[PDB]
Amino acid sequence: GFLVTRHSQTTDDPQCPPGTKILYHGYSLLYVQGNERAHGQDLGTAGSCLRKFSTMPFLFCNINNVCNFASRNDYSYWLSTPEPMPMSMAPITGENIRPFISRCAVCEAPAMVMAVHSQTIQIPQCPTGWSSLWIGYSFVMHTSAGAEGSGQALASPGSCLEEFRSAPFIECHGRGTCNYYANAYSFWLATIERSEMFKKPTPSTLKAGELRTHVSRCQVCMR
Amino acid sequence: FLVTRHSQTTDDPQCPPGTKILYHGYSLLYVQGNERAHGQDLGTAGSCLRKFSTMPFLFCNINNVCNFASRNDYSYWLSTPEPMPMSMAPITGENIRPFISRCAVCEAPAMVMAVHSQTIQIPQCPTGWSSLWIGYSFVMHTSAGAEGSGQALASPGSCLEEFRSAPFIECHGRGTCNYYANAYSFWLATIERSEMFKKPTPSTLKAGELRTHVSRCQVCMRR
Amino acid sequence: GFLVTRHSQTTDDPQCPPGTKILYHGYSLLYVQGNERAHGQDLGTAGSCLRKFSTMPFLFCNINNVCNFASRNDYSYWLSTPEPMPMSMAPITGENIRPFISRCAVCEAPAMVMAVHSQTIQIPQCPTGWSSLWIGYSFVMHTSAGAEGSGQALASPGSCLEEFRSAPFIECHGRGTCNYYANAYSFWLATIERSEMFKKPTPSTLKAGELRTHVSRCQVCMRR
Amino acid sequence: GFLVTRHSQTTDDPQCPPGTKILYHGYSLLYVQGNERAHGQDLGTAGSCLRKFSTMPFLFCNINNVCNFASRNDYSYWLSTPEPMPMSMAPITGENIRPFISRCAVCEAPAMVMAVHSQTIQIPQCPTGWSSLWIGYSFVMHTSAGAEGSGQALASPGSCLEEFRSAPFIECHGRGTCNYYANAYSFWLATIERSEMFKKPTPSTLKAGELRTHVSRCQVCMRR
Amino acid sequence: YLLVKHSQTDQEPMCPVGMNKLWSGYSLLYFEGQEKAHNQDLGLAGSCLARFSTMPFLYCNPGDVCYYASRNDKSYWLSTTAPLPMMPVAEEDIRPYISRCSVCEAPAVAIAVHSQDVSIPHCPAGWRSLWIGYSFLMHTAAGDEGGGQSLVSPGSCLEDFRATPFIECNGARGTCHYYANKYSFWLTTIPEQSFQGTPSADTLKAGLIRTHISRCQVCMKN
Amino acid sequence: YLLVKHSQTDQEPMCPVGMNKLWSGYSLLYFEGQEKAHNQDLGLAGSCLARFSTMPFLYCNPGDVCYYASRNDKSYWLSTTAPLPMMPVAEEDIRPYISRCSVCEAPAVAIAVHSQDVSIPHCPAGWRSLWIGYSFLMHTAAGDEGGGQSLVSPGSCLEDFRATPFIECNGARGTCHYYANKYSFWLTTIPEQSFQGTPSADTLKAGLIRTHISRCQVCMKN
């Protein structure tokens, strides 16, 4: 019973890769933050694909047998779409949030699925005996409020996003608001020239148009 | 393929039908060393230790010296329905046994996963998968220093059979364990369709009104 | 000009101690938390006394020249009154918050002020040549959401609260809510027997009616 | 002998306020971050004014009695000037860093100096018997790398910056690099109307042109 | 299924006979970005990076700006027996310090079993042993950042015990070094048969350590 | 005005002749509750605690329950030159390790000045020297908790440079010890007259350390 989760990074349901069957579609959950502590769900697993969305998909209980829902100051983070940040740059609420949330598909595969990374701008070949499911960019971790966050396993399909985005996720709050913030950081595997492996890294500051020049590529494969 | 089950009581749980017993042990939730929390997913054998201890680990430094139970580290274990001491004072030695949950690590013929409904309704297993058990959606937790860990929603560990406002107990190298006021358990909330893209409605629930506001789950095995 | 701040821990303005003159009254600010980081204001300083209350008394700006007010997930913490926690145990909002916020007074003193602690259940005498302003309990630090928090300087009047409270402060949010939470912890100097200074501490769990048995006492004094 | 510290927020040495005499001039140190722990120097104290600048003005020593200087990944933060952020947005190094570092002056005052905040766009009056040294904006706290940071005492002149800057400080590394990063946040006291005190705060996002108008004003006064 | 092996030496490990090697690389423990650790399970292929670099990642902000080796981030790798230097090692000198790994294609899943005893635990019936080692639980270094291993994962069972099984590389500096705050945590050898409600504090010096570290075995069915 | 002095030895400091001693005590650096450090300024009286204890505080929750030495909190104190122990020291054996202090009534305020140079900085004109020392800036220990001193406070000027100027006491255990993650941070000496844009990394071993530590003087008006 092998499973693979795919994220469209758009408001449309992604399609199950060739050879796999759909189980269900949902919204792309990246991680949550309760009592200021972050806990993520690997993007390559079904845990990152929830059928129902909410800026507050969880609640907390105490040893006094009292549970509180949306009653403190907690967060939820979701993979986002190409929808531009509002001109007002103010938080988004209610139905206006829907255009920003990524969709996902949980599919059952005949065999084991994995991701491989080239650590170069070229797409890495699937290991011998493995077939391609999709290609993308090496997404490894992220941080936001309080510099808290989580990341992906490098052999998980979750570490391979098909669409590169400087801002691949949006931040939501128990109060019902969501927005992008300047400290929302996305970390990606970088390109490394073989001759530079044991040499001091050469610093690079990339702007729109040249961002992908140092981002490693990947391919998700199935045995 | 392995499946780990936690009784949440002092008796060993039974392997679900179709699985074979490997060993029994105590339910380890996570540890905290030098202020850093590190958990063992409850769906994995790592959350089932053959031997219990309030301090099951030690640390070693660069001068090649290791220290055991000499500082201020913690260990956390799933607990039983055993009443909290009226004195509310720390529990020590053999008196700790009644509070520690037991577990079983079983070998299964196929992979096992968990599904969540995000409603009071029990989520059916995907076509082609049979049920192992049902429970409540357990996501994360925090305790000392607001540190903690969480479960993978696709893992059986995110599906506890018995809902507990206080599902775990905190222990120290001192040989003391207790339930403290800052012990928080986080669970997936129930979400009505029309509530998805609407500001969450805050709610504080008290005894007898908790279980029915926590998302339900079911652990399934490909068969 | 020396100053001393006093907190009533009630809805009434505290009065300046004998020998001091009033500057202004306000609300007792304990600390704030922005982008998950706490920053406090010593209770013995005027910074802990704000004339205007708000669940969100600050805003933040970024390098892109954009400022955001009450637009993320920040906190403010204030000393509270003995107003009981609501029966519903749900967050308090709007005008209903006022009854929970402690008041303060910033007073100008003719000489320096300080606090002394006994580390016993007995009130410590003021140093020779120093007169009394008020007595209290040794309040040293606190933590709440994310185990973040701040504390008081032990020679500051801020480390000497006149009223002992297991829950001396309340938590408020940018969204406009305030409430007490189970992880809101208050730390106090404990009583230490002289013969036990270099002995393994004897653990104690205290419940209502016996809490103060291990809480150190203090006295705020002024140089004569 | 009371002391007053002033920050020019430019490459020029600030002048000591009237009624005070210069002790020394230096560079405006906001805080440092060592082994991931941030530690600040209140901007109203002489500690925020260092005679010598360095991207790494400190070192650390271990239990084996070995100290390491600029060998790991530590930081130093300084108040900055109006110098334009490099168009490339790439790290600034060596001599090129000088134009970005604020200067300061530590002066000896005849009496105590404190700050008062209005929590409105209006300038707060100095208490009776006190005279104004300067007016500014209420600066409370800040965060940068790892969401770590520090803040100011609201009673301290350090909480009253004479020039509002959405990005009042720059981040430097032991490597010798400095830059403005997107996660550098400055927190300021907000303006609160009497009727807004006990009402849910109204969220607002302000852009260039309307920033200074929602920031609390302050005045630094001397008891003389 | 994939089997991952870390040699803990500067020589890549051999894949068990019958298992094809997908690739060899360097033992990645974790990345530290913005003072936040992100670990790779030592039992998973993601912990075996084909290309090494003191700074193997970059980061971007919503303003469409990405920075590579332009701040103060770092990386952590499993290390070898190369002697602790008195000062950071740079560029080529780093090579002898980095552990190597191999990702092998296996017939079944491999697990780790721990005894929490000086006794080496047996593999479940029907499972064969791949290797024996010590119970590696967690680690911390700069600040309180670090991480740990899954006890059922082969990554929690290292063949060679090391007081300091990993090294720190300071990203943009292009150097790696052993700092005094590095800590390795291991499961203990418990004297009691199955319940220890009262641990007896102890300090162990080099030479009396290994007999106090929980033992483990990595197993695969068949 | 109060002058606080820490001896860094097990003998209480003598108040300068003429200054009345309010009390003597033990040098308190910080408390750690719920893994959150709360420091006392070494130049303020709050850092001189009359009565010592490995657990000098307690805590309470809103449910009207207080716990004293019933969890995992700790305290930190400035220490003496007592030798690093092979294992934690308990109860009476702790005494030789804790620094003593004295709080004295002064006629004027005392400040610290730092040279960030090998040379001793001058007290401001019209101020007299009380003592000379090294620029103690900050510290860290368990996790990434710790704290620092105000550079204008006499607490930032320790007469005795110590790579490890403080000791950790583990609360309820009733013992103190020196752990490998303890770090002291000091202002450096800078060659340049006023501007140093590119620090040159360096590792200093016992014997060549003091010449790289910034110097300071604690001064009092008149």
Ligand SMILES: [Ca+2]
């Ligand atoms: Ca940290």
Ligand SMILES: [Ca+2]
């Ligand atoms: Ca911490």
Ligand SMILES: [Cl-]
């Ligand atoms: Cl919430």
Ligand SMILES: [Cl-]
């Ligand atoms: Cl311990």
Ligand SMILES: [Cl-]
């Ligand atoms: Cl907010």
Ligand SMILES: [Cl-]
């Ligand atoms: Cl550095």
Ligand SMILES: [Cl-]
């Ligand atoms: Cl970097």
Ligand SMILES: [Cl-]
């Ligand atoms: Cl304790």
Ligand SMILES: [K+]
């Ligand atoms: K922002």
Ligand SMILES: [K+]
């Ligand atoms: K408690």
Ligand SMILES: [K+]
């Ligand atoms: K609560």
Ligand SMILES: [K+]
């Ligand atoms: K940035």
Ligand SMILES: [K+]
């Ligand atoms: K070191």
Ligand SMILES: [K+]
């Ligand atoms: K140690």
